[PDB]
Structures are given as structure tokens and as C-alpha cells.
Amino acid sequence: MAKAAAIGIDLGTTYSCVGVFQHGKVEIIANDQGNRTTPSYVAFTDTERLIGDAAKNQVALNPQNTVFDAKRLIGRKFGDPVVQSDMKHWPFQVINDGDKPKVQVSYKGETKAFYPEEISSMVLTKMKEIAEAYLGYPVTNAVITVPAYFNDSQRQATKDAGVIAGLNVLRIINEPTAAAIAYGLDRTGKGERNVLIFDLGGGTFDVSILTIDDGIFEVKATAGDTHLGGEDFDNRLVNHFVEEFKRKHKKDISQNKRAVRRLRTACERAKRTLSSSTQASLEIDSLFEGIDFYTSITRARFEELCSDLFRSTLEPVEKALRDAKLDKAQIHDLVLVGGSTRIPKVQKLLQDFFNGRDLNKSINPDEAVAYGAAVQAAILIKSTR
Ligand SMILES: Nc1ncnc2c1nc(Cl)n2[C@@H]1O[C@H](CO)[C@@H](O)[C@H]1O
């Protein structure tokens, strides 16, 4: 029953996803709001602790006590230059507890501090409860994914987050390996198969090159930009609309925190529409000083606004190929991961760079990692019996 069942969890920097392999198919499980991915956010309020969508939805009202980006801290020392650099950009407090970072918040009127693995365990507990509500019984066996560049300390702290969350961690697997499993790229028989995984998420960009030799995975190269993702494209749309509002009304809105956040969420929505329509409409009632902001933008203008950022995704692709010592024609498969890879210009740039090659994109890119993790979790729990 429950003992023979296992889930696959993609514990992402900005979003998390849970899947289950049963009756010959993967089911990506929707949360209680009907969403197939859940924000990796934890909010501490005057009455309760919120996780996911509810935590993300009140971030503007409670920024000091809404934790996100815990994956940037997990398994790291406080003194680590990555931690010191990131801390300057977060609205929540990060404290030092014996060279270990803790996030410090106000919860039910009291000061509380949490280890990054405790924050990640709350996200994991939510994913576990989403699976349990779908299945009708508690599932405790799980495969949890991590970036291919995570070291032993980051992998151990992720497994610790799983234990705190009440999960039996069957295995910690690499995100690009889970994505290659999702597409069945490890079941092509004999001979070395070179796979490039292009992973463009909400806040990070990762390029991974794997060799699959008779079912055995080997990471040949990892490249990317830890501070490039979908939110930089939302911000480019924000700056455009702030300049358009100034041209139409002779009013600078950039200082009104509420106006900027409402414009930001509308821009994120319009950006998603631009992946399947050649135009998107913004409809903001009373954006600033009672002025409605009803406008539109073409996919062509959006592509111009992010042009330099889209083109920058090809430098880590070239870098990964040189580190792996492979030419473009030596790569057998190209896999898309992350919601941002739905952007047609991004697909066109990658396809042209690989001389007109087909891309593996039939599995929802923001779900491919949980999909593969779910497949692996089913194989592993069957072998355990
Ligand atoms: N249809 C889409 N077109 C463009 N961007 C998208 C799309 N879907 C998602 Cl999710 N994202 C973005 O992916 C990230 C999460 O993986 C977020 O930045 C989200 O906006």
C-alpha cells in the first residue's frame, strides 16, 4: 500500500513540484489551489505559518518574515562569499550560529530562527501533504533532486531537510539526471549517449552535459548563471511599462512599492501569454493616483527588451561544451527544463546554435525533473520490495 509507494520531489529554488508513478504513468500532483508547481516560500505571520501559494501571495505585506531562496543557503557556511553576497538582497534577516546561517523571523509575536534545512523541510512537508491528499494515504518514501554542482554538504543538508519533513529519502539525484530519465534517455540500449540539459528557471540558469553509458550517468560539465532567470525578464517588462506610464502621464511610479509590485505580477502573467500569443494585454485598475493602465505589448517588443539576456544563455552552453571537450554535433539529445524555456525566442536561439536540431520539450519543462524523480522513486521502491 503506502510502503510500496514512492514520490519524486523537485525541490526548486523558486518553485517545487511533486510527482507519482502509478499504473504505467507519471501524475504531476496539483496542490489545493490546482497548481502543478508550488512556490518554495515560507511565511511567518501573527497567527500562522504559510507555505507555497498562500506564502507567496502575502510577500508584499510581510517581506521581513517571508522566507524564500533557502536553497541558496542550504549546506553552506555563514562565511561563504555566496551567502555574504546574497544576504544583501534579501528582506529577511540571516544570522550566524557557529559559522552556520539561520534565517531569523518574527512568528506569533516571537523572534524565531531556522536553519535552511528547517525552512526546506517545511516546503518538503507541504509537497508530502499534497501527494497524500491526492493518493488518499500517507506516502513517506521519496526521491529528492539537487543541482548537479551541489557538493556533499549541500546534498546531506537536503537529505536532512527530507528527514525533518518525515520522508524516507530513497536517494538524492541530480536534476539533469532526473530530466534525462523523464525522456527515457537512459534506455536507448548500448553506447555512450551525450545529453545537454538547458535549465532556465525563475531565478537560476543551469547547463549540464551528461554521458549515459549503458544506463550509467556521468556529469561531464556544469555551467550557467546562478542569478539569471525568468524574474529578470519580468523586471525588463516592468522598466518598459514604468517608462511608458511616464510618457503617457508624466508621472514616475517607480517609488510607489504597491504600483511596482502590481505591475510586476501583471508583467509575469503577460510574459507567459507571450509564449503562446504574439501580443498580451495588461489591465491594471487604478495603478497609480487613480489612473488605469490598460495597454499591450507584442512578442517582438518583449524579445527586444530581453534580447541581451536571451543571447547570454549561449555563453554557458559553449563553456559547457569546451569543459566536456565535445563539439555540438557530438551531443545526441537536447532537453529543456524550467518554465522560461517555453519562451519561443529562447528555443529558437538554442535550436539555431545546435544547427536546427529538434528539442526535447514535450514534457512540461517546469515538471520534467519531478517527472524523472517519480520514475526513479518507483524503480527504487520496487527494488526495495
Ligand atoms: N509560459 C511561460 N512562458 C514564459 N515563462 C514561463 C512560462 N511558464 C512559466 Cl512557469 N514561466 C516562468 O518560469 C519560471 C518558473 O520555472 C518563472 O519565471 C515563470 O514566470
Question: What span, in angstroms and rounded, lies between the C-alpha atoms of 293 and 373?
Answer: 43
Residues 6+ apart with CB under 8 A from 248: none
Interval between CA 292 and ligand 1 midpoint (Å): 26
- Whether 339 has a binding-site annotation, put simply, is yes
| Nearest by Cα to 31 from 17, 48, 14 | 17
What distance in Å separates the CA atoms of residue 366 and residue 36, rounded to the nearest whole number? Answer: 9
Environment class of 290 (CB within 10 Å of its CB; exposed 0-12, middle 13-18, buried 19+):
exposed
Technique that determined the structure: X-ray
Asked whether the CA dihedral 197, 16, 74, 7 is positive or negative, the reply is negative
**Measured CA distances, 271 to 79, 85, 91, 247, 359 (Å):** 37, 29, 25, 22, 21
Give the residue from 46, 66, 44, 42 showing the smallest Cα distance to 108: 46
CA of 140 to the centre of ligand 1 (A): 30
Bridge partners of residue 9, in order along the sequence: 18, 144
Answer yes or no: is the C-beta of 19 below 6 A from any ligand 1 atom: no
Provide the CA 22 distance to its chain's centre, in angstroms: 25
C-alpha angle 334-340-345 in degrees, rounded to nearest 5: 75
Burial 83-98, CB ≥16 within 10 A → b, else e: beebbeebebbbeeee
What is Dmax (Cα atoms) for the chain? 69
Contact 336, 365 (CB under 8 A): yes
**This structure's resolution (angstroms)?**
2.2
Residue with cell 539569471: 228
Which domains are seen in the chain, by residue range? Answer: 1-67+123-187+361-381 (3.30.420.40), 68-122 (3.30.30.30), 188-228+313-360 (3.30.420.40), 229-312 (3.90.640.10)
Taking the centre of ligand 1 as the mean of its atom positions, its distance from the CA of residue 148, in whole angstroms, is 22
d(CA 161, CA 179): 22
| 272 Cβ inside 6 Å of ligand 1 | yes
In a mutational test of the pocket of ligand 1, which residue from 28, 271, 341 has the highest number of ligand atoms less than 8 Å from its CB? 271
Contact (CB, 8 A) for 180 and 193: no
Element of type H or E holding 202: none
